[PDB]
A and B are shown apart, each in its own frame.
Chain A
Amino acid sequence: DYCQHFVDTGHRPQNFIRDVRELIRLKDELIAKSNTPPMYLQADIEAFDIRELTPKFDVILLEPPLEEYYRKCWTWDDIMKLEIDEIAAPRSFIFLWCGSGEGLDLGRVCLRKWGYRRCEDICWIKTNKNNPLDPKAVFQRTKEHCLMGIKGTDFIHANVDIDLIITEEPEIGNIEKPVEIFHIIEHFCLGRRRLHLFGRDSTIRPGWLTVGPTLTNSNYNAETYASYFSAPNSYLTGCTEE
């Protein structure tokens, strides 16, 4: 009983998960080849009209800075008023980092508000191998959820990933999410128009447009960006040859 152990020793049960030959590396190789150059834009999203972000996106990764990450923050009031449906493609995916509190409920409201249904729930399970409190909390919270949503109505790329990410709990005040979420997303081969809202200089990445208030530089040009998906490139999965 690892629960009983955690009560006795402070080692989270997930410290005891181990190992966390079909090589899905040509996928990652094909992704790398089709990736657009990284594009990024400093923008104060509370003051910025997201409709300027074109074309519509096949994938949106939404990482609002929640108050619970710190122990400008966005409340679920602010997040729910983002017009995400105005930039999402009719068939597209969202990945929303929800924290571990009321966000598990309000994030689902958001997804429905914006026209998606939740398809998966990706749990970021944080180990404390190197270092063995909400008022409403019944339990010590040791994980965060990233909700996957689909909207709208295969290929050669199948599912290879599990819905858990296991890493060590980062140092206090480190708000970065595990880069492994980018891998789960890119492994799907969802399309090439990928947007990361509330990204940072540290999260900029090939194949993605990053938009955030703390970016120090911008290179986004709406016409240049759209040219990466012009014919005959419009409908690629991101996982096929150039």
Chain B
Amino acid sequence: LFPPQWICCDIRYLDVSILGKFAVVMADPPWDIPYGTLTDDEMRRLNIPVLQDDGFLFLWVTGRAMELGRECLNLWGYERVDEIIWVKTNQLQRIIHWLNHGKEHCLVGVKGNPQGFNQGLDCDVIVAEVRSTSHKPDEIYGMIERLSPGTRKIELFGRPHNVQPNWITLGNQLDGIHLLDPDVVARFKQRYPDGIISK
């Protein structure tokens, strides 16, 4: 079901087996490098492996999560095959411990053998304006849509502004539960007949 869907939840505790398989997973984790951060062990233990059979994973990383996210990627069953760089600019196209940081990193992992994707349409550099401290650039969704048009996608740790068509968004600051895909609704009602996600 094309239009945006979301689930307000603790991603540690949601049973993601109810969501189906997705051509693309994106995650912007609250790495422990505060608000609602996950320990390294909690990140490792996330049940990413059930989310895909054949597809790509986009994993935002900074600091030592550049290494930790590579570990998670491989533990979850992915090979890192690309790395997107977002060059941070102001509205005038100028760049915003040992070095000042002008960019943010997003690892790209592959699982299985994805077929019918448009690899090589975009290049691995994004140039875009900073907004709120916590706001990834919306160009990533266009690159992902062109890479895999029409397919189902899931975002982990997104925020309300991140809900997009063809995407199910998960995060603990979303407003309730909004599900439209009939297969997801059925499996959700079975798993959570009183609409609560604990333990």
Q: Is the CB of A7 within 8 A of B122?
A: yes
11 CB < 8 A contacts A-B:
A2-B126, A7-B121, A123-B85, A136-B79, A136-B81, A137-B81, A138-B110, A140-B122, A159-B98, A161-B99, A188-B98
Given A121-B66, A159-B99, A159-B100 in contact, is the A139-B123 Cβ separation under 8 Å?
Answer: yes
In the bound complex, what is the Cα–Cα distance between A19 and B128 (angstroms)? 15
| Closest CB in chain B relative to A234 CB, distance in Å | 23
Instruction: Tell which of A7, A19, A105, A137 touches B70, judged by Cβ atoms closer than 8 Å.
Output: A105
Does any Cβ of B come within 8 Å of A184's Cβ?
yes
A147 to B85, CA, bound (A): 15
Q: Which residues of B contact A121 (CB under 8 A)?
A: 66, 105
Closest to B80 in A: A105
- The residue on A at minimum CB distance from B109 is A138
A176 → B minimal CB distance (Å)? 20
B93 interface neighbour in A17, A108, A125, A161, Cβ under 8 Å: A17
CA distance A20 to B85 in the complex (A): 17
A163→B103 contact, CB < 8 A: yes
**Which residues of chain A have a CB within 8 Å of any CB of chain B?**
1-4, 6-7, 12-14, 16-20, 100, 104-105, 108, 118-123, 125, 133-134, 136-143, 145, 148, 159, 161-164, 184, 188
B163 interfacial contact with A, CB 8 Å: no
B82 adjacent to A3 (CB under 8 Å)? no
**CA separation between A134 and B80, bound complex, in Å?**
13
Interchain CB contact (< 8 A) of A162 among B89, B100, B124: B100
Contact B87 A14, beta carbon cutoff 8 Å: yes
B125 touches A119 (CB 8 A): no
A19–B123 contact, CB under 8 A?
no
A-B contacts besides A2-B139, A125-B125, 18 pairs, CB < 8 Å: A3-B123, A4-B142, A12-B125, A14-B125, A17-B89, A100-B124, A104-B83, A121-B66, A122-B99, A136-B110, A137-B81, A137-B82, A137-B119, A142-B125, A143-B124, A148-B99, A162-B101, A163-B99
Docked-complex contact A3 and B95, CB < 8 angstroms? no
Q: How far is the CB of B122 from chain A (nearest CB, A)?
A: 5
C-alpha gap A100/B83 in the complex (Å): 8
Contact in complex: A13, B103 (CB < 8 Å)? no
Q: How far is the CB of B85 from chain A (nearest CB, A)?
A: 6
Given A139-B122, A139-B123, A142-B124, are A163 and B146 neighbors across the interface (CB < 8 Å)?
no
Kindly list chain B residues whose C-beta atoms are within 8 Å of the C-beta of A18: 92-94
Question: Counting chain B CB atoms within 10 Å of each CB, which of A13, A17, A136, A141 scores highest?
Answer: A13
Q: Is B38 an interface residue (CB 8 A)?
A: no
Are B126 and A13 in touch, CB under 8 angstroms?
A: yes
Q: A119 near B123 (CB under 8 angstroms)?
A: no
Contact A108 B67, beta carbon cutoff 8 Å:
yes
Q: Which residues of the other chain, B, contact A134 by a CB distance below 8 angstroms?
A: 81
Partner of A1, one of B92, B120, B142: B142
Task: Let me know if A140 and B98 touch, CB within 8 A.
Answer: no
B156 at the interface (CB under 8 A from A): no
Among A3, A100, A125, A142, residue most surrounded by chain B Cβ atoms (within 10 Å): A3
Question: Which of B85, B110, B117, B124 has the most CB atoms of chain A within a 10 A radius of its CB?
Answer: B124
B19: Cβ under 8 A from any A Cβ: no
Write the B46-83 contact mask toward A (1 if CB under 8 angstroms, else 0). Answer: 00000000001000000000110010000000011111
CB-based contact A119/B97 at 8 Å: yes
Structural contact, A143 and B102, CB atoms closer than 8 A: no
In Å, the complex CA distance between A128 and B43 comes to: 39
Q: Contacts of B184 on A, CB cut-off 8 Å? A: none
Q: Are A138 and B98 in contact (CB under 8 A)?
A: no
Contact at A13–B98, with CB atoms within 8 Å? no
B8 interface residue per 8 A CB criterion: no
Residues of B within 8 A of A118 (CB): 66-67
